[PDB]
PDB file of C-alpha atoms and ligand atoms in Angstrom:
ATOM      1  CA  UNK A   1    -146.683 -39.800  26.608  1.00 52.98           C
ATOM      2  CA  UNK A   2    -144.365 -37.206  25.108  1.00 53.44           C
ATOM      3  CA  UNK A   3    -144.500 -33.848  26.855  1.00 52.44           C
ATOM      4  CA  UNK A   4    -143.354 -30.529  25.449  1.00 51.09           C
ATOM      5  CA  UNK A   5    -140.818 -28.074  26.828  1.00 49.26           C
ATOM      6  CA  UNK A   6    -143.220 -25.664  28.534  1.00 50.59           C
ATOM      7  CA  UNK A   7    -145.464 -28.519  29.705  1.00 49.83           C
ATOM      8  CA  UNK A   8    -142.472 -30.065  31.489  1.00 53.10           C
ATOM      9  CA  UNK A   9    -141.597 -26.632  32.871  1.00 52.38           C
ATOM     10  CA  UNK A  10    -145.021 -26.502  34.513  1.00 50.49           C
ATOM     11  CA  UNK A  11    -145.037 -30.076  35.875  1.00 49.06           C
ATOM     12  CA  UNK A  12    -141.566 -29.939  37.486  1.00 51.34           C
ATOM     13  CA  UNK A  13    -142.516 -26.874  39.599  1.00 51.85           C
ATOM     14  CA  UNK A  14    -141.788 -28.732  42.865  1.00 53.40           C
ATOM     15  CA  UNK A  15    -138.152 -29.327  41.892  1.00 53.91           C
ATOM     16  CA  UNK A  16    -137.496 -25.598  41.527  1.00 56.77           C
ATOM     17  CA  UNK A  17    -134.215 -24.887  43.261  1.00 56.39           C
ATOM     18  CA  UNK A  18    -134.145 -28.172  45.167  1.00 59.38           C
ATOM     19  CA  UNK A  19    -130.502 -29.211  45.502  1.00 59.01           C
ATOM     20  CA  UNK A  20    -129.605 -25.994  43.708  1.00 59.04           C
ATOM     21  CA  UNK A  21    -131.039 -27.096  40.347  1.00 58.77           C
ATOM     22  CA  UNK A  22    -133.161 -24.576  38.446  1.00 59.59           C
ATOM     23  CA  UNK A  23    -136.212 -25.413  36.345  1.00 56.25           C
ATOM     24  CA  UNK A  24    -134.308 -24.547  33.108  1.00 60.40           C
ATOM     25  CA  UNK A  25    -131.650 -27.059  34.133  1.00 61.62           C
ATOM     26  CA  UNK A  26    -134.290 -29.751  34.695  1.00 60.53           C
ATOM     27  CA  UNK A  27    -136.151 -29.003  31.454  1.00 61.87           C
ATOM     28  CA  UNK A  28    -132.809 -29.199  29.644  1.00 65.55           C
ATOM     29  CA  UNK A  29    -131.769 -32.372  31.487  1.00 65.13           C
ATOM     30  CA  UNK A  30    -134.979 -34.318  30.954  1.00 65.81           C
ATOM     31  CA  UNK A  31    -135.033 -33.320  27.264  1.00 67.46           C
ATOM     32  CA  UNK A  32    -131.602 -34.942  26.850  1.00 66.06           C
ATOM     33  CA  UNK A  33    -132.304 -37.894  29.161  1.00 64.81           C
ATOM     34  CA  UNK A  34    -135.667 -39.155  27.894  1.00 64.70           C
ATOM     35  CA  UNK A  35    -136.768 -36.781  25.105  1.00 66.95           C
ATOM     36  CA  UNK A  36    -139.664 -35.741  27.414  1.00 66.12           C
ATOM     37  CA  UNK A  37    -141.207 -39.219  27.126  1.00 70.57           C
ATOM     38  CA  UNK A  38    -142.773 -40.319  30.399  1.00 74.62           C
ATOM     39  CA  UNK A  39    -142.779 -43.904  29.067  1.00 76.64           C
ATOM     40  CA  UNK A  40    -139.182 -44.130  27.898  1.00 76.77           C
ATOM     41  CA  UNK A  41    -137.497 -47.444  28.683  1.00 72.51           C
ATOM     42  CA  UNK A  42    -133.788 -48.201  28.126  1.00 70.69           C
ATOM     43  CA  UNK A  43    -132.745 -51.725  29.118  1.00 69.72           C
ATOM     44  CA  UNK A  44    -129.547 -53.832  29.259  1.00 69.05           C
ATOM     45  CA  UNK A  45    -129.178 -57.403  30.374  1.00 66.04           C
ATOM     46  CA  UNK A  46    -128.188 -55.935  33.754  1.00 67.81           C
ATOM     47  CA  UNK A  47    -130.340 -52.818  34.314  1.00 67.48           C
ATOM     48  CA  UNK A  48    -133.440 -50.959  33.148  1.00 65.05           C
ATOM     49  CA  UNK A  49    -134.098 -47.217  33.247  1.00 65.71           C
ATOM     50  CA  UNK A  50    -137.609 -45.836  33.517  1.00 66.93           C
ATOM     51  CA  UNK A  51    -139.643 -42.778  32.628  1.00 67.01           C
ATOM     52  CA  UNK A  52    -138.943 -39.074  32.209  1.00 63.95           C
ATOM     53  CA  UNK A  53    -135.985 -39.195  34.632  1.00 64.79           C
ATOM     54  CA  UNK A  54    -134.638 -42.631  33.568  1.00 64.31           C
ATOM     55  CA  UNK A  55    -134.496 -43.990  37.113  1.00 61.18           C
ATOM     56  CA  UNK A  56    -132.675 -47.319  37.240  1.00 60.02           C
ATOM     57  CA  UNK A  57    -133.762 -50.600  38.811  1.00 60.57           C
ATOM     58  CA  UNK A  58    -130.285 -51.316  40.228  1.00 58.52           C
ATOM     59  CA  UNK A  59    -130.756 -49.356  43.437  1.00 55.59           C
ATOM     60  CA  UNK A  60    -133.717 -46.944  43.233  1.00 54.73           C
ATOM     61  CA  UNK A  61    -136.851 -48.988  42.486  1.00 51.39           C
ATOM     62  CA  UNK A  62    -137.653 -52.676  42.150  1.00 51.81           C
ATOM     63  CA  UNK A  63    -139.126 -54.590  39.226  1.00 51.95           C
ATOM     64  CA  UNK A  64    -139.018 -58.096  37.738  1.00 54.40           C
ATOM     65  CA  UNK A  65    -135.481 -57.791  36.322  1.00 54.17           C
ATOM     66  CA  UNK A  66    -134.011 -57.040  39.770  1.00 53.97           C
ATOM     67  CA  UNK A  67    -136.542 -57.991  42.489  1.00 52.60           C
ATOM     68  CA  UNK A  68    -133.713 -57.689  45.038  1.00 54.58           C
ATOM     69  CA  UNK A  69    -132.957 -54.050  44.165  1.00 52.75           C
ATOM     70  CA  UNK A  70    -132.072 -51.954  47.185  1.00 54.42           C
ATOM     71  CA  UNK A  71    -135.280 -50.070  46.279  1.00 55.40           C
ATOM     72  CA  UNK A  72    -134.132 -46.876  47.972  1.00 51.86           C
ATOM     73  CA  UNK A  73    -137.162 -45.008  46.628  1.00 50.69           C
ATOM     74  CA  UNK A  74    -139.363 -47.851  47.956  1.00 46.10           C
ATOM     75  CA  UNK A  75    -141.560 -48.165  44.893  1.00 42.51           C
ATOM     76  CA  UNK A  76    -142.227 -50.373  41.901  1.00 40.72           C
ATOM     77  CA  UNK A  77    -140.407 -48.987  38.842  1.00 41.02           C
ATOM     78  CA  UNK A  78    -143.555 -49.144  36.712  1.00 40.00           C
ATOM     79  CA  UNK A  79    -144.946 -46.211  38.722  1.00 41.51           C
ATOM     80  CA  UNK A  80    -142.425 -44.164  36.700  1.00 42.00           C
ATOM     81  CA  UNK A  81    -144.171 -45.077  33.415  1.00 42.29           C
ATOM     82  CA  UNK A  82    -147.504 -43.281  33.949  1.00 43.39           C
ATOM     83  CA  UNK A  83    -148.424 -39.601  33.532  1.00 42.50           C
ATOM     84  CA  UNK A  84    -148.386 -38.688  37.236  1.00 38.66           C
ATOM     85  CA  UNK A  85    -144.875 -37.353  37.976  1.00 36.38           C
ATOM     86  CA  UNK A  86    -145.607 -36.844  41.702  1.00 35.55           C
ATOM     87  CA  UNK A  87    -143.934 -40.068  42.814  1.00 30.36           C
ATOM     88  CA  UNK A  88    -141.202 -39.728  40.127  1.00 33.62           C
ATOM     89  CA  UNK A  89    -140.297 -36.376  41.655  1.00 34.46           C
ATOM     90  CA  UNK A  90    -140.153 -37.725  45.219  1.00 36.90           C
ATOM     91  CA  UNK A  91    -137.702 -40.360  44.009  1.00 39.29           C
ATOM     92  CA  UNK A  92    -135.676 -37.741  42.106  1.00 39.29           C
ATOM     93  CA  UNK A  93    -135.351 -35.758  45.370  1.00 42.48           C
ATOM     94  CA  UNK A  94    -133.967 -38.862  47.104  1.00 42.90           C
ATOM     95  CA  UNK A  95    -131.435 -39.364  44.300  1.00 40.01           C
ATOM     96  CA  UNK A  96    -130.392 -35.724  44.676  1.00 41.46           C
ATOM     97  CA  UNK A  97    -129.872 -36.025  48.463  1.00 42.72           C
ATOM     98  CA  UNK A  98    -127.671 -39.103  48.030  1.00 42.59           C
ATOM     99  CA  UNK A  99    -125.652 -38.721  44.781  1.00 46.70           C
ATOM    100  CA  UNK A 100    -126.521 -35.262  43.424  1.00 47.08           C
ATOM    101  CA  UNK A 101    -127.344 -33.940  39.969  1.00 46.47           C
ATOM    102  CA  UNK A 102    -124.612 -36.016  38.302  1.00 43.27           C
ATOM    103  CA  UNK A 103    -126.704 -39.147  38.399  1.00 44.42           C
ATOM    104  CA  UNK A 104    -127.863 -37.408  35.172  1.00 43.66           C
ATOM    105  CA  UNK A 105    -124.843 -37.245  32.878  1.00 43.10           C
ATOM    106  CA  UNK A 106    -126.685 -34.986  30.449  1.00 42.09           C
ATOM    107  CA  UNK A 107    -126.676 -32.219  33.025  1.00 42.04           C
ATOM    108  CA  UNK A 108    -122.919 -31.528  33.101  1.00 44.04           C
ATOM    109  CA  UNK A 109    -122.369 -32.234  29.397  1.00 45.12           C
ATOM    110  CA  UNK A 110    -125.317 -30.302  28.007  1.00 46.82           C
ATOM    111  CA  UNK A 111    -127.304 -28.339  30.612  1.00 43.23           C
ATOM    112  CA  UNK A 112    -125.049 -26.113  32.754  1.00 43.28           C
ATOM    113  CA  UNK A 113    -124.602 -23.188  30.314  1.00 43.62           C
ATOM    114  CA  UNK A 114    -126.939 -21.533  27.776  1.00 41.11           C
ATOM    115  CA  UNK A 115    -130.107 -22.089  29.798  1.00 40.47           C
ATOM    116  CA  UNK A 116    -131.898 -19.296  27.883  1.00 39.23           C
ATOM    117  CA  UNK A 117    -133.305 -21.927  25.462  1.00 40.90           C
ATOM    118  CA  UNK A 118    -135.093 -23.697  28.360  1.00 43.65           C
ATOM    119  CA  UNK A 119    -137.128 -20.829  29.840  1.00 43.53           C
ATOM    120  CA  UNK A 120    -140.932 -20.736  29.829  1.00 44.10           C
ATOM    121  CA  UNK A 121    -141.292 -17.593  31.970  1.00 42.02           C
ATOM    122  CA  UNK A 122    -140.775 -13.832  31.988  1.00 44.32           C
TER     123      UNK A 122
HETATM  124 CA1  LIG B   1    -145.422 -41.651  38.151  1.00 46.93          CA
END
């Protein structure tokens, strides 16, 4: 399920300012992390990343590839492949508390300057 820029802007409302990250920063980051696809999957032979935020099964959620994951977000990773971002966002907030925005490498490289392109508001 591929979202669009101003759709994502609307659905990430609850992240506004949390951890000091603006909505433009999040719209920019998720564009460059998953292409706005809530069903994106990127997988090695040692880890899998899931959904709009590309949350990994090494420490954040558990799945079949790593049943022994620390599962810090306490949730099955496949809950990050549906169209309800509510539980995705709760897990994102936990990632922010523990390791900060730089879990998402796209943020520093591509989404910390020129945020005009990512606004869907006055
Ligand atoms: Ca979900």
